[PDB]
Each structure stands twice: as structure tokens, then as C-alpha cells.
Amino acid sequence: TSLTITEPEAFMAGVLVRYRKTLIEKTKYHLGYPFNLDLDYGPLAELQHFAINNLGDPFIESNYGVHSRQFEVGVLDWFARLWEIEQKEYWGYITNGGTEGNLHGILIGREVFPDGIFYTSRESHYSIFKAARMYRMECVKVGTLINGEIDCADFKAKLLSNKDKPAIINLNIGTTVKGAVDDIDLVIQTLEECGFSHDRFYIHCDGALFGFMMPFLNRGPKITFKKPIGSVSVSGHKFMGCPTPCGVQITRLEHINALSRNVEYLASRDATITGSRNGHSPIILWYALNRKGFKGFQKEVQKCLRNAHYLKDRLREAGISAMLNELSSTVVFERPLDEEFVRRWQLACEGNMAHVIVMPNVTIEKLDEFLNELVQKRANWYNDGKAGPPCLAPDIGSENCDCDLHKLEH
Amino acid sequence: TSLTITEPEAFMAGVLVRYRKTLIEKTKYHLGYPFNLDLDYGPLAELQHFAINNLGDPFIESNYGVHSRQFEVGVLDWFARLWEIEQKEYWGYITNGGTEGNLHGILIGREVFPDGIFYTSRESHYSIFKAARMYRMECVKVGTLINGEIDCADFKAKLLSNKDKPAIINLNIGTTVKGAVDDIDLVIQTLEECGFSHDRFYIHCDGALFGFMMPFLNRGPKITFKKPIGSVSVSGHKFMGCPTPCGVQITRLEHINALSRNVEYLASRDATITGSRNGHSPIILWYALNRKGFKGFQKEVQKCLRNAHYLKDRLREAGISAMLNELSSTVVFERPLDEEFVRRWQLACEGNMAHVIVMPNVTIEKLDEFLNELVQKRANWYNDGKAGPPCLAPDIGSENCDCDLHKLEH
Ligand SMILES: [Ca+2]
Ligand SMILES: [Ca+2]
Ligand SMILES: [Zn+2]
Ligand SMILES: [Zn+2]
């Protein structure tokens, strides 16, 4: 459905009204992807009048004056507080998304250790493997437990067979498909007891969704630069919500010296992946953090976990295979067989799993509308004498599978 | 000037009114950077209500439904027509800027030729060298004529000393500082006559500013995939104008197969540098191309060249060193000595050069306000018996220098 451009009104603002309609509709039924669709930023749309560009370092003002560094630096300072690094220990910037933050953090680690072996789990986001290939790093794929966590036994095994070289590591704070959280503490411990001291490994934390969310609980492996991590990224258009993709990458200031170069025509430094940078995003994220604070976010997070547990419980009671990890708003379940149902609710699918990500816009009323439809349609899919439901035990563990075999065991 | 975030109105919408004021002011006096500040996109700011995300390939719809691919594909088709490649010969996407397009095009070339030597001029944008380092390519810096063009003699010399390996080449369609245009035709010719056939070289065209502008003249070395180029990038927030940085990268479809990988949870492919992608940009660029067409752009371009020639002429008549290349809106001139004057007009500086880029928002009335101030202040800078003006002959040629020595020669 492409929309051809013709040489020279009505036809154009006609299109905006129709498109706006299809977006309202798509927004109503969206469940599959970790994007917060509850956007409360109406006062800021004045600013679409200016060409805001934070071109260069956030902490060194370029000669391009139409920028939002006041906001950007505010937001970054908040993130530094959130992850416990002090003003004079940290560098970072507001990115174009979680994949830019991954490319930045992995690049930083390659520069700390050019001979470094790179390690990540099999359930790392495609951005991580893209980065290693772009960067010509040796990528060792570490195995994974049933639930998605990195397997620190297989990790240990792999560390010891490359004991000469330093270790560069990506950890998944909330894997894309299953919503697992790599055990930072155990990973650190495993390194130390294979004779990797702090000065022979670099850890990047990919927290595109859950990295934002986890500091608002009193639970789980804390993300803090008091541990020997190297950098942490988050996507701003995931939990916080932002009309355009953005994110936040924060690293140790010591680490940024190897990337940072003066660029005379900016009167700034280039330590970012990008050149020109979105300067609306920093304002949008500043507005949100201010309106809501750590209390407003903690609420939204706790309600999202509650609503995911609800969804999971309702699915199990309908005898549909489903899992929800401890620290997660990602409900993995039996992949709907009706692919037009998949497209209507915009579900992400891998193999025999689909998932719903319960973002602030995802309400109980909306989960019920969905469970209604899914249950009605499921009845026509696996009726005798057709094959009967797929077994998700290999994906989510047999405790969570409700196929013909595993429903009996519970 | 950072802006601290505090836990919970007036204080916030107070800030927006003050910030909006400083942006109006900064927009009034901006001359140094290639950003079109004449933004006519008021009807589209409704859409800041949606989380538009073109996540994945522009031509394969992902399951995330809140996207602008209708627009994106329209815009890309227009660019394909503009650079003369047919619907079934080309792939491309709307990027986050000219640096993403550079990283994409250089990556494509590295995959066509993994053993390839990379060549660019000394006056390539910092993005180009950043890419080669990120990508661990061998970068051979080719020398440059006075005016900024790549020196195809020094090119030839360098080609022949690496005659075994294939050649990957970046060409600067409008260099950042001086506004030069690498001679594509001559570069091609030089390759052919050093025994590089089409299947042993890849050319990327960096056209962040002037790549958009040049097809609207009947002059200069035409950008066309009928010649053996590999890819062309442009920045959308440069000439066309866009509140957020964006761009357009177009390559040959044959070339994209080496990067493109299916990602099951998108139900799309990943052939981009990025993951999540701005889906407002494609709409903004679609609106602009439609309102104005090839006629509206041709006008804006011709007026920008006219206004640059004006600025240059006025500068020479005040006996201020200045150059304007043939195919350029970039007026290079004696770097103001008053750095607060530099910051007031937001000029980009390198060495003894500054420059004004004459973008559609840059009017004659505004150029005159600037020439007035510059001329008044210049009188206090080089009065006897202080040193007298710097010599820009090494930078811009002695025909364009008006120092104490070279002003005599003309
Ligand atoms: Ca329960
Ligand atoms: Ca003239
Ligand atoms: Zn089973
Ligand atoms: Zn001179």
C-alpha cells in the first residue's frame, strides 16, 4: 500500500484524516511489541516548528544553537542517579533507540579490549549479533535456560576455553521474546572465579525495555555501576513512551576517551554513533520524568506486572500454554494458529510462541476483549480429530505447557 | 545550563515559553550549518499523538501496525526516480541522518568486497572515518585540490599501489567545510584506466546536503545509477527541512542481500543499521515533496545559489577573503576573530575559515543584517599596527584571498 507522489490542499488533508483513522484503530488493538502508546505530550508539539538538533556531545555545546541540551543533560543526570553513577564518573547521550545504545556500548567494549572475545546468549536481540558482525568481533553464543536467562554454566565452560583473551559481554536485561533477565551477579561471580579480574572484562547491559523498569522494584539483580558493568542502554519509546524512537546510553567517563574526537566545525566532540541527533526526544523524556517522577513510574511498572500476571492467569485457566518470568511484563503463550488474528492484535511470534507485552496503555478491559476473541477462535483450531495443541514445553518448560500430554501433569 | 529534574503545571509551561523564546532567537541568527529552518509542517503535528515506528524493512510490513510505510515507500520511489534507478533494481530506507546513510553505504561496500581498500578525500566528513574505524577497514586518505575536490591524480597514484585488492570509495557530493563536489565521472574513468572494472570497485556517494540539490540543476556530474555507483545518501533535515534529523539511503537491490536477515518476531527483515525507526519523518518528507514537487525544489535551490553568490560578492567588495564553489551554497570566508560573533551567528569554523550555508530560510535581508555587523566589527580587528588579516590562499586559493599580500594581485 504505497502512496505515489505527483507534481502540482484537499487530496492531502484527506489522506491525513484517513491515515489518522487507521492509526487510531491500530493503536486500539496493539499488544505484541514493547511500545508505550499512552503518549501524553500535547503541549510539546509547538516545538515541531523548530529544527532541534543536539549535534555533538551533550556536555560540550556545539555552535549550532537550536538544541535541547538543557533537557538532555537533565535526563541523563536522572539516569545516572537511577543507575548509581556520579556526575563526574559518567558519560552518555540520548540515542535514536536501543539498537544505537547496543552499538555504542559494544563498540566501547571493543575499544577497551580490541582482542576481546564477545559473549552473549542465544536469546540476545538481533541488534547484538548485527553489532559484532559490523564490528568484526568474534561472537561466542552462550546457551540459555528454558526461561531465557543466560546459562552461567555454559558461560563458565566457554570463558575457560578462551582464558588468554579478555571478555566482552552483553547481558540481556529483559530478552525480546521471553522477557528473561540475565543474572548479572552470577555472571560477575563466574568471571571472578575463572580468573577474570575487573580489568579483563567489560559488561554491557541491554535494557531496552526492562532496564528502565527494574530499578522501580525492590527485587532482582540491581543495575548499578557500583558493580563492574561498563554501560547500560534503554529505549525511551519502549516504557516511558515517545512518538519517535529514542533511548539513553550511559557509560563510564573513563571509557568514552577512546571514541571521543574533537571536530573543529562543530566546536564539539564526536563520541556518538550518530552525527545530527534528535533534540525533541530529550524534551519529551524530560517532560515525562518531571510530570511523573520515580513515584509515577513505580506505579505504572507495578500495574504492568499486575496486568501481565492477570493475562497469564486467564490464559492458563483457558488451558492455553503461557509463561511469565519473575521480573517481566512479557507473557509468552501458544502461538495463535490464525495469522489474521496475529495481525489484528499485532503479536510478535517465534516458532510456537507468541507474546503480549503489557505496556501502560494495555488495560484489563483490553486484555479481556482479546481473551474473549482468542478463546472463541481457539475452539475451531484443535477440535478432534485435528492434531491438538502444540507442545511449548521445549520453549517455556512443561510446568507451563497445556498441550494434550502436559496439561495432565498439573 | 542543565535543567534539574525534581519529584512532584506552572514551572514547566513557564520553561516552554522561555525555551521557545531562545529558539526563536537562535533560529533568527543561524547561518553556519546546512539545516533548512523554514519548516512548514503544522498540520502533521497531530501525529505526535501516535508512536509511529517503521521497525523493519520499508517494503516488508512488520506486525507492528502503527507505521508510515505508505509514505516511506512513496518518498523512496521519488528518490529512486530522482537518481534514475527502477523500482525493481533498488532498495533503500529513510534513516536518522546522513551519518546513518554513510554507515550503511560503507557497510554495503565492505560486504561486496571484504578485502577492499577504502578510499576517501582528506575533506570527507568525520562520519566517514568513524565508519572505517568502526568497521575495521583500511582507510587510504586521498589528497584534495585547493577547492576541496578529491585529487584524482593522487587517487590514481594510490589506486595503483593497491592494485591487487578491490576498491571501496566514498565520494563527497558537497564537502562539509568548502562545499566541493568530487568529480564522479573522472573518478570512474580513473578506476577504469587503472584496470578496475565495475566488478572490482564500489562507490558510495555522500550527498548529505548537495546530493539532494544537484539533480535540480542542468549542470555538474550527474548522480545516476546508470553510472556504476553503489549507493547514495542524503539528509532530509538539511535541504528539505525536518524538525528531527532524517535521511534517505538508496542502493542497488543486488547489494542488499548480504545485510538482509529475516527476524521472525518482526515478521520483517533487518537490512538497516537501526531497529526501531522514525515513522514521522517519512510523512514529513512526503508532505514536502508533494506540496512542492520538482519545480518547487528547483526554485528553492536556484535561489539558495543566487543568495550565496550574493553573499560572496558582498564579502569580496568589503575586501574579505571568500570563496564559493561552482555547485554550492557554502560560502567560505575569513574566520571572524570575535568568537562571540561566531556564536551569535552560529558559524562553523575550521582553521582560518568560517562558512555560511545559505539554506531556504537564509534571506537577503538576513545576509545584509550579518554583513553590516561583520563589516563594523572587522574594522577593529586588523587596524594598524596589529597583525593585519590572515592569508586564506592555502585554504581557498590566492585568487580568493584578500590579505595584505593577495589583495594586490587582483
Ligand atoms: Ca497468579
Ligand atoms: Ca558574481
Ligand atoms: Zn506439552
Ligand atoms: Zn593571502
Residue numbers in the entry:
A (entry chain A), B (entry chain A): 62 to 69, 80 to 481
The authors write:
Ethylamine (EA), the precursor of theanine biosynthesis, is synthesized from alanine decarboxylation by alanine decarboxylase (AlaDC) in tea plants. In this study, we solved the X-ray crystal structures of AlaDC from Camellia sinensis (CsAlaDC) and SerDC from Arabidopsis thaliana (AtSerDC). CsAlaDC and AtSerDC are Group II PLP-dependent amino acid decarboxylases, which exhibit numerous structural features common to other amino acid decarboxylases. The overall structure of CsAlaDC or AtSerDC is homodimeric with two subunits exhibiting an asymmetrical arrangement.
The crystal structures of the CsAlaDC-EA complex and AtSerDC were obtained and further analyzed. In the former complex, PLP bound to Lys309 via a Schiff base linkage (internal aldimine form), and the pyridine moiety of PLP is positioned between the imidazole ring of His196 and the methyl group of Ala279 in a parallel orientation to the imidazole ring. The carboxylic group of Asp277 stabilizes the N1 of PLP by a salt bridge interaction, providing the latter with the strong electrophilicity necessary to stabilize carbon ion intermediates during enzymatic catalysis. The O3 forms hydrogen bonds with Thr247 and Lys309. Additionally, His308, Gly169, Thr170, Lys309, and Ser347*(‘*’ denotes the amino acids on adjacent subunits) establish a hydrogen bonding network with the phosphate group of PLP, consequently fortifying its attachment to the protein. Upon superimposing the active site residues of CsAlaDC apo and CsAlaDC-EA complex, it was observed that the hydroxyl group of Tyr336* in the CsAlaDC-EA complex exhibits a substantial 60 degree deviation along the Cα-Cβ bond. After the transaldimation of the internal aldimine within CsAlaDC, resulting in the release of the active-site residue Lys309, the pyridoxal-5-phosphate (PLP) amino acid external aldimine undergoes decarboxylation, leading to the removal of the α-carboxyl group as CO2. This process generates a quinonoid intermediate that is stabilized by the delocalization of paired electrons. The carbanion at Cα is subsequently protonated by the acidic p-hydroxyl group of Tyr336* located on the large loop, facilitated by its neighboring residue His196, which is situated on the small loop.
